[PDB]
């Protein structure tokens, strides 16, 4: 019925889904891998969007972050890894994504996440924020924590894919 | 291939907030079941039949949505219905803790079920069935929070 309508997003059944999962991923952990694996099972396509210029200077540069993530996620056919340097809502628009994936680890994050979602709704009404809880296994890890443990020789092999673990060891002498 | 999602609740009764969540979910998943708990621990204002009927009417315009009552383990219902997604609306911080706990338990009971969380629209962020009932019980105007069919039914329950 193309000559009458191109069709609306709401009220008309299921549409093609393309999701972005933004973060600094400095570096990507098993927690991140779990979130994106789960998202990629339920949406047609998923972009891991890596922030180029985070306010806090990252341990790994963008190129390194993108390369490590690309390797770590290569086994997921409907996932792609990109860097970006914009508002997540702008990247989403540029990429023609209709879903924004957010991990929801802590109660402290909830207020902030709801606020960002309201802002993103204002910036791009056609973008839906979707929230996934981390698996219990990964619920206490973060990039930051793994780095700090590793800096003082703690064992973090269980928390990272092999490629990332090696790269982290190299960064720490 | 297929996504089939369940959105469980007591829906006593369904509000505009619930309608918003399920509209959004139905745009992203092939099929959505509104699963209405038959026997909630606190006795509801509307019985299951009434809850199902009100919701059915309120959601009739969504082609890929179906409304059903259920009275068993969510993992069993989801299995019986061949659902792979569980939708929750996430309004308050107090709800988040509880929902995360249930999600961990559901992961244990049914690993192939993925729990997904949506935030309510700012418009509906402070409403709940409970709140709307309490306001309405003391004659407050709740027309803005309910679809017409539900509003009428609620007025009847309070007269």
């Amino acid at each position: 019925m193309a000559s009458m309508t191109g069709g609306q997003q709401m009220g008309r059944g299921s549409m093609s889904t393309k999701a972005i999962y933004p973060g600094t991923f400095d570096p990507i952990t098993n927690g991140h891998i779990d979130i994106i694996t789960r998202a990629a099972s339920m949406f047609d396509r998923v972009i891991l969007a890596i922030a180029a210029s985070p306010s806090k200077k990252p341990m790994f540069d963008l190129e390194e972050r993108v390369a490590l993530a690309t390797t770590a996620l290569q086994h997921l056919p409907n996932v792609e890894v990109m860097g970006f340097s914009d508002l997540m809502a702008n990247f989403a628009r540029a990429q023609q994504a209709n879903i924004l994936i957010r991990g929801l680890r802590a109660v402290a994050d909830f207020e902030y996440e709801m606020q960002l979602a309201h802002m993103n709704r204002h910036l791009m009404p056609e973008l839906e924020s979707v929230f996934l809880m981390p698996s219990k296994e990964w619920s206490f890890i973060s990039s930051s924590l793994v780095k700090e443990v590793a800096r003082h020789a703690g064992d973090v092999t269980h928390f990272l894919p092999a490629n990332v673990h090696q790269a982290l060891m190299e960064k720490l002498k």
Side-chain angles (χ1 to χ4, degrees), chain A:
Chain A
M1 211 170 94
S3 53
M4 186 60 59
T5 193
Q8 231 165 28
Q9 183 70 11
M10 296 294 167
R12 300 179 68 257
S14 191
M15 309 284 124
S16 302
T17 48
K18 184 187 187 177
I20 63 164
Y21 182 24
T24 51
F25 303 111
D26 178 49
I28 191 171
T29 77
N30 287 353
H32 296 130
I33 297 178
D34 178 64
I35 299 291
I36 194 156
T37 295
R38 287 163 45 216
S41 73
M42 58 179 77
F43 301 124
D44 300 312
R45 294 161 70 196
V46 184
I47 298 169
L48 197 84
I50 305 187
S53 316
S55 59
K56 195 189 165 191
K57 184 195 186 187
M59 172 169 292
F60 300 85
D61 71 15
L62 182 59
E63 185 162 349
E64 290 173 316
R65 289 183 285 131
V66 167
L68 291 170
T70 296
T71 301
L73 297 176
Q74 86 197 345
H75 62 291
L76 301 169
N78 62 327
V79 171
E80 61 190 309
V81 179
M82 302 180 69
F84 78 109
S85 69
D86 201 355
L87 299 182
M88 44 183 77
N90 285 348
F91 184 70
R93 198 185 273 103
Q95 288 305 128
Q96 305 190 64
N98 50 2
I99 293 162
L100 179 47
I101 300 300
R102 307 293 290 173
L104 222 56
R105 190 158 53 231
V107 166
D109 303 315
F110 177 81
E111 292 283 75
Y112 166 71
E113 285 294 336
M114 189 178 325
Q115 278 172 123
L116 172 59
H118 289 151
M119 179 53 81
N120 280 332
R121 277 179 196 124
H122 166 268
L123 290 178
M124 182 175 173
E126 64 275 9
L127 182 66
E128 296 295 329
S129 295
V130 166
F131 298 97
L132 305 184
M133 310 276 200
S135 169
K136 182 168 59 86
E137 182 79 303
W138 312 126
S139 49
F140 67 86
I141 69 163
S142 70
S143 286
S144 294
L145 188 54
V146 167
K147 286 181 297 188
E148 206 64 48
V149 168
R151 176 165 296 117
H152 302 90
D155 178 19
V156 295
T157 51
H158 178 71
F159 305 133
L160 303 172
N163 71 303
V164 173
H165 186 271
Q166 196 52 58
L168 180 56
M169 294 307 99
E170 281 304 287
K171 282 285 174 154
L172 295 171
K173 313 187 293 160

